[PDB]
Amino acid sequence: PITGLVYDQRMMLHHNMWDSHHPELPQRISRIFSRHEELRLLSRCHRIPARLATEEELALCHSSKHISIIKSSEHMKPRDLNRLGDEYNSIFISNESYTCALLAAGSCFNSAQAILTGQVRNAVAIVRPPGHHAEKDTACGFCFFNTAALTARYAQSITRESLRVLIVDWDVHHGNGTQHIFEEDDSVLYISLHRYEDGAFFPNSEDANYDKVGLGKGRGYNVNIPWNGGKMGDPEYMAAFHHLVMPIAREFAPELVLVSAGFDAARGDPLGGFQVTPEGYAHLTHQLMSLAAGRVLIILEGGYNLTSISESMSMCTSMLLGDSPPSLDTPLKTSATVSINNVLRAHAPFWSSL
């Protein structure tokens, strides 16, 4: 009954060499790690080693062009790093970025392998840079390679090709790259909750709306839960899990759960504007633990208030370790009722549980 934990200080080497205060900070991961130490969660976990992803593994989801361009940045002079970063939507690059992206993905592969070999029941991955905005062919939104999507394909590569992987993306932003990578796929169920604001919120695409349900054999296996016009928090997220996430997930019957666990919907985040609490994140984690015989891998995505992400992800690890769910302190914001009902209208044709 072991919980794994992967953390490697070398992932702090990725940095913004022009803006030391850019919110995707190296100390995001060291702060989360430190809070696990203070709460004495670290010694209750088995340490899973980091490793570099291989180029062959990156090619599970990304084009060889994209791999080669990010790879080339390791030897790039500052002016060229600045210019290359500016060719993407919201990317900064340093000479260490490629290696850190490789480390984040490989750390998650090792964690998924530890779960799927029965060496640990579940695991938490304290990694950066994040992944869920990265597309097959391009970097986006602080993300170079799509760690969670690659981990889903990696898991299938060591088990069977059609292994049912659920990805729950509770980062406040839509994971455009994860949706696109699996949009035609019925073996990977993508469920995202995100601030949407009728397409005005990053990443600024109507691809994130509730009516994008998947394509081809993937029709029904893409679930977007978009928030509009309100400061959403625990009641809205609990209601979305109750009416949507958990009924769909149970019907899908995943063999592995990956959480694209951004903590930028947390109270205090400078970018998300929401107010999910650490206790809320613990309850979402505990609900997901009922799936896939407990095989849950929690993967850090966004989240930019250092205190908020440290308390929030530590509470998630406490849940993985088997601790009792904390006590939770309200009627939904009206637009959140509308959002949930819109998703129910979009997906009840595909899911008998709805």
User: Out of Zn ion, K ion, none, which partner does residue 233 contact, by CB within 5 to 8 A per kind?
Assistant: none
Side-chain half-sphere exposure of 54, counting CA atoms within 13 A: 5
Check residue 244 and report its DSSP letter. I
Of 99 and 159, nearer to K ion (C-beta) is 159
Considering the complex, what minimum distance in angstroms separates the CB of residue 130 from K ion?
11
Stretch that binds Zn ion, among 121-129, 155-163, 258-266, 311-319 (CB under 5 A): 258-266
What's the residue count for the chain? 354
Task: Give me the 168-197 binding string for Zn ion, x by CB under 5 A, dash otherwise.
Answer: ---x-x------------------------
Q: Residues of 130-160 as b/e, b for ≥16 C-beta within 10 angstroms? A: bbbbbbeebbbbbbbbbbbbbbbbbbbbebe
Which residues lie closer than 8 Å to 32 by C-beta, 6 or more apart? 7, 126, 300, 309, 310, 313, 314
Residues of this chain, 86-105, that bind K ion according to CB under 5 A: none
Q: Where are the beta strands (DSSP E) in the chain?
A: 3-7, 46-47, 122-126, 165-169, 188-195, 222-227, 256-261, 296-300
Rounded-to-integer distance, Cα 214 and Cα 176, Å: 13
Would you say 173 is a known binding-site residue? yes
234 near Zn ion, judged by CB under 5 A? no
Q: Is 182 in the site for K ion (CB under 5 A)?
A: yes
Cα→Cα distances 140→70, 101, 106, Å: 12, 13, 20
Smallest gap from residue 170 Cβ to K ion (A)? 6
Q: Determine whether 14 is an active site residue.
A: no
| Active-site option among 15, 132, 133, 174 | 133
> CA dihedral defined by 198, 201, 207, 210, rounded to 10 degrees?
-50
182 binds, options Zn ion, K ion, none, Cβ within 5 to 8 A by partner type: K ion
- The answer to the question of whether 137 is labelled as a binding residue is no
226 binds Zn ion (CB under 5 A): no
254 binds Zn ion (CB under 5 A): no
Site string for K ion, 202-241 (x = CB under 5 A): ----------------x--xx-------------------
Maximum alpha-carbon separation in the chain: 55
Q: Which is nearer to Zn ion, 35 or 194 (CB)?
A: 194
Using rule CB under 5 A, residue 131 touches Zn ion: no
Could you say whether residue 301 binds K ion (CB under 5 A)? Answer: no
The answer for residues whose C-beta is within 8 angstroms of residue 85's C-beta and 6 or more apart is 91, 92, 93
Tokens 């790879």, residue located = 71
Task: Return d(Cα 190, Cα 249) in angstroms, integer.
Answer: 10
Between 241 and 304, CB nearer to Zn ion? 304
- Binding residues for Zn(2+), by number, are 171, 173, 264
Q: Which residues have a catalytic role annotated?
A: 133
Give the residues lining the site for K ion (CB under 5 A): 169, 171, 182, 185, 190, 192, 194, 218, 221-222
Query: Which residues of the shown chain bind Zn ion in the complex (CB under 5 A)?
Result: 171, 173, 262, 264, 302
